[model samples]
Target: QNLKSTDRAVQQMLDKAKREGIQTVWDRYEAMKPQCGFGETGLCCRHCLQGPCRINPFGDEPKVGICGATAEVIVARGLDRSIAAGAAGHSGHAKHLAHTLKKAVQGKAASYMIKDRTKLHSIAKRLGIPTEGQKDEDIALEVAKAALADFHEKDTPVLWVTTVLPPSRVKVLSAHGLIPAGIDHEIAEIMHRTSMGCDADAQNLLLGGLRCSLADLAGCYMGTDLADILFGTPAPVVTESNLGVLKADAVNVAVHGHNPVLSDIIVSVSKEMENEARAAGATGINVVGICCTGNEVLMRHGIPACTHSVSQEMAMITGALDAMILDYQCIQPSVATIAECTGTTVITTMEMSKITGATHVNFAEEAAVENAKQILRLAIDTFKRRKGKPVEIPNIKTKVVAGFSTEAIINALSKLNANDPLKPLIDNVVNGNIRGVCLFAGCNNVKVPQDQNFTTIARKLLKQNVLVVATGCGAGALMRHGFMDPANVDELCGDGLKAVLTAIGEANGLGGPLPPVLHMGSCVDNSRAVALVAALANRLGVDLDRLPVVASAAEWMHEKAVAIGTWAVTIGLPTHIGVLPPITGSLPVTQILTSSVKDITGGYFIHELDPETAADKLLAAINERRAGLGLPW
Candidate 1:
């Protein structure tokens, strides 16, 4: 119970790492133990050459930074920068997709094309681009143009933000001046305001951070949208998961990171190289995934994910993995070192991210398929070099039914009520068959036991009949634990939840119940969860605040996760985060987030570290909203 990871395969790798004297994330965390308290509370500042200042959290002395900034200003500025950095990370990802889309429509990217013409048309129509008489290419070109334009300093509100949310939510954000004018503009404004000796008003700094987080929301929405438009919206995919997915007799290539640009092509071209891998003395080629990139392909193509998040290095530790191909975000450089020990070729395939020790294949859209083929060839060659080598892959995996995008969920619901797709779900919620909704999201952290918090909370909520959906590592954790397997429904779900899930499955012609936990896509695809909730809110004629929707990033560790948490709160749903976000240095700042923010946005932070306690708090928040709706709890 006190082990570093709840995953069977992961624990095996940790044991292996220890036996081989190889350091892992957990070991590094222990070495950095007794971490700086000032940084933990957001009271440390090194913004300029002036000083590395730490305000005394005990309020004994050193109450201000070298620049005479109070604890509040320092904490607020730190949060603003984190939000802005996270916004830039996501928006930059979206911008990359926009450019790629532009290239595909213009016949510049041969390997990539419009896999989802319907999604393209859907986006075009939503953006008010005339698609009736125009060719698909033309409409897509326009869509790509609009997506690109949203990143610049726009005269109007960012299109993605306004379009993704209900108009009432838009009005609420506008009223608070939180509606971002443009993605990059808000990020730039945040950087300027949070700089040394500038904008020291703590309250105003938090407001700027809210605006940036909203920009992050826009970027996330567009990232999911463009990914669907280019590489097909994910439908239900039955797959396997965990380190057991690594094939001993085949070339095991693991895709890491967030973007699907190159990874999607690799999964496709991997098929053609199967015989090549066989010729190289392997049975065939087997492509697995890790992290959000894993989520992307797993949801789209039924590819089994090897692992995710903090346990990514364990995929290499399995010793059966032939290669680790990475794109960007959440990929640890430690993986490159792990690969060196395992004789796995660590391949980096992006201009934006290149590890020092890993092999690089300069990726271009013009030669997308060729680049993928080249990358696989290297892996196949590595498989040859390591052939007949001793390998240990734990016989551990779970049956997973993943890829529950918002549209897919609605389509399944339409089977029950063709004229009104949301009716069945709405009725279930109102009738007490389904109590409320909870979305599990964000990353795994080394600080907490891996996958422990996610599984613990999910079990508690599902048994309480709370309709649960998960994305990113939350989805990974649940799927690995059989939460995404329909067979587990009888054991994991309450009778009320079981009845609703079974009915949906039967109506959709499925032989058995749907999975207890819906596996929505990767990190950016939290947009899918928002879309589902927004539809429910719009149908009920209520704002987001009135819905019985709660969220948790139980083991998050990234700035992207923080940005996501802030936006979730801004949109007026109580969100739970297991790790305390750094802002405790200022009582007012922490109070604004954990307490006072609810008065303004009807959303507040539930900063609980214990999984059981967090689940109780989320259920309480759900019951509070249910009461507001005049429904029995």
Candidate 2:
């Protein structure tokens, strides 16, 4: 009876799946146990057609690949490719938005408009584009063009990399040969370098990987900046999470994946589709979010998250969810498999991100609203079939006070000290009222029980008075676990942290404390965390490495998390990753990541699996930074 999750809703679904003899992620994971030794150790290489070479992990003969590539080379190359793939995925998302924004500004996409003109001008100003006496559309067009230009190879470094990060970090990256010339350029260069018989030196290969990982950062920043300009920078939005958000009498549509372009209008259009759904024998059209799509809408619109990551199937398992409209990334294809058993209609939107068994509705921003309505009509039609069917929706959920973008946090802090918002926070840090800041990030891997590591580590950190911010599925896990409930502040946060929360809460006229954990948008908005630290660094006159802050991806699974983690460390934050990336087979590579990189970047990796031990490690990292800054603990 090995339960794979701490989430009650997921546990209930697993029980039902087990009783019905239906397979789930956990089942598939169990089947894939004792996974590949060579692949797991990064000793496998399939770079060229000559051979699918695998090196021995033990000290036996044939210590190199068929190409004479050593374990370190194979491992480093593999790791570099993972970084490139991740950068490509994330950068692809930003590039998509860049095109959409271009179309909108040119009057081709009538369905979309610049919702946040202030944010648009802010980006224009930051990019050094002339905004004076310019139309919002013109400024937007310039910004979008600038964004797309950063994708190709160029003489200058990636503009976002040069603009967003602190001066010291930019210099450090430049000194260490870690600055990416362009987003697409670095990813392409990594593939070429990691190709068969190209870059064999592990350290040199890793340097290329680090530079590529910075491209992921550039993508993340551009995604956040562009999204805010289009969708409006997120402010606090009260919402709900878990399976129970699904209404039995209503049409439940889950928005899954990362892009806001496909999901935002779906959420907005749902508001107008209520009467239509009610006309179809439903009380209303209820829109929910699944992964980062949920995070995006939850940030802007207060949409309830149905589930996330490995447990995405649980949303359909509820059997009440009529349709799951997915965009891209972290969306399991098995959702369609599960949809066959249940009446849930899995709708894929993008041509690039398609599911074989699911229905495809090609999305275009020119007809963005109509496209959303079309998708909703499909969901409503599916509701007609799922209507009379018996469905089991677990009665479990919690209130989530999410949408804590950097601007939102600053605005709230400004309520206390409008003249100087960072003053109160810096004062608290110096006095030990708040122990430190920890930005919890990344995904939920099946290797660790869902949410267990995040919760265990978070609970310890919160009790120790750490100010916490979370993004992506880390936000999903914590929001689902009641960490985003502001009312739980007294019960959940240490008195030191509680005082700070209440101080900000009361200042902003919030009835109680701010939630113990701040929800900082989606995977894209991890850039928000970087922006937050950059702001703190600017005010404190120090770099990110000296700030009393750290980051953790406790149960990371995605290659995107790898890129994000690598960039997090590159920016001089001590980044803890509980699930070690497959570099353990090479001690030198492991040492470089866990230790040697600290000398070069002033940041290193913390690879600890035990939640308690991880908390200890993260806390120590934070305290060490605190001491470095001469702040009292």
Candidate 3:
């Protein structure tokens, strides 16, 4: 097998790693060859004190665990745990932001303030917080309070779930008993229900997973709204991406991980501290992004994105970075080894996520500006230490148009029709000038070549006139490649989609065609795509399940991706995962996930590992949805 990735810069870095004797993720993957089959098929269970159970998929051994649990029960329990974990990850992020926001309102966090007063006021009005004749801070306090309440409230559903979702969609969820009462409560319940002997019925346990998935959706929406209020909503911006974004002559500081709380301030302070960097014998301070943090900053400030999940070490392998400031999530611990080899400083800013070999700088919202300044000063100091180090920056980068917030999309559509912005898009879909929409999400996996699935499936879908939107590492993949470049539309898109994009771009005063793929922000910003779909469903006077839309995590390799996929299916969109999920060991569980779940939720998972086949299935599903809507396919 070829060790090279789909990206030229990444392949170059891999070659460099080979020369330097640094082990990449691919090397470790090869070392773990012929990995456990029982675990891969979801037949292994170690959830409790019971025997670390394993059921024979080939029917050569016992079909039940030592605790008398059937394969279906074990598989459902495992899936529920994964969903709970995903929900907890997102909801915990939401809780942290809400706490910070509340502290800011109380004057306890001096460095934090309502940066987007428009968003604050809008959210307050939507939540019925009485923003009339109120100060921005006062309304912000109420908004923060309401968001925190959603995590603790038990009698009523999360306020964000009720506020953001359409009434028809809410009814469907409520009727199915899938509505989440509280974000934290649902996650906790999953843990309690999946305990030893509880929730033995596979179907019941799966329903519990669905409810927790709703909590994940609610948390994601709340996180996006709060982030917009605190960091300002993203607007249309242009940027570059790839490992080549790293500057050889400048003090390169890469902000890795998720959560924009610290990265946002770093972006602000970098401009103010440029002189210090120049005085230290560097040209300027080059702040590039990694993973979701890169997505966050790239959307708001047009900062260049450097790398994604699996390619993070490759960024440091280029030997150009002075410091890699990490916050939380999807950050590889092995980055410390790579940074050490490259003479790069790895700084951990979060108190809970400190790596052993990295420098610890606890970031506080109360002193955010000063902390950000200190972090930059450290990077500048590191640049001096890296003066004589040999570095090779790849000459690979691509221009991308990002920051298509739901608001930005509507704003652009408003240019075509001032009164009804969605009209033009709706008309295009109805008239067959454009096909349905597909959302690409999740991370890069070492199991497959990096970005191969995302790029191939995207091209296939684009050629079939399907509109593509991406978030998380999937967006990073498209950005690093040329998919997010407007110039590719004429070559990659079908005639109908090409014409639609060109007309829309011209109507919005853009001189050329819009990129066929719209970059929606970070993983949490997947909420933006959901909001767009909900708006379309509302405009059509139908439930979300009735909309001609689909979602796929083509190269997903995380539990959060599973949680996201569950929510996508719950909302009635057929979802695809290029990597096979672990529930295949149980025939009953597998059947429910792949086929029977559609009867209950109007959505099902398609487990096609081949990118071209996945695209074909997605397009066929879109046509099926269109036919159901009595529209021409």
TM-score of each: 0.99, 0.99, 0.98
User: How well does model 2 score by local distance difference test?
Assistant: 0.90
Model 2: per-residue lDDT, tens digit, 169-281?
A: 88988988888888998999999999988999989998898899999999999999988988888998888999999999999999999998989899889999999999999
| Local distance difference test values of all predictions, in order | 0.91, 0.90, 0.89
Q: What are the per-model numbers of colliding residue pairs?
A: 0, 0, 0
Name the runs in model 1 displaced over 4 angstroms: none
Q: What TM-score, to 2 decimals, does candidate 1 have?
A: 0.99
**Model 2 deviation from the true structure expressed as Cα RMSD, one decimal place:** 1.0
Q: Write the per-residue lDDT of candidate 1 for residues 1-633, one digit (tens) a residue.
A: 247888878888899989998899999988998999999999899899897988998857788898898999999999999989889888988999999999998989888899999999989988889998999999999999999999887676899989888889898888888899999999999989988989999878988888899899999999999999999999988999998888899999999989999899999999998978878988888999999999999999998988999988888887888888999999999988877788999999898899999999999989998898889999998998887888889999999999899999999999999999999999999999999999999999988889999999999999999999999998999999999999999999999999999999998888899999999999899989999999999999999999999999999988998899999998888999998877988898998889988876788889999999999999999999999999999
Tens digit per residue, CA lDDT, model 3, 1-633? 244479889998898998889998999998998999988999988977777989999867778888889999999999999998888888877878888888988999877778888889888987889988988878988889888889875566787887787798788778888888888889899999988877799999998898899899888888899989888899999999998888888999999988888898899999989998899999999999999988999999999999899889988888888899999889989988777788888999988899998988989998889889888999999889878888999999999999999999988888889999998999999988788999999999999899999999999989989989999999999888898899988889999899888988998888988898999999999999999998998888988788889998999988888899999998888999988888999889989888998987888999999998999999999999999999998
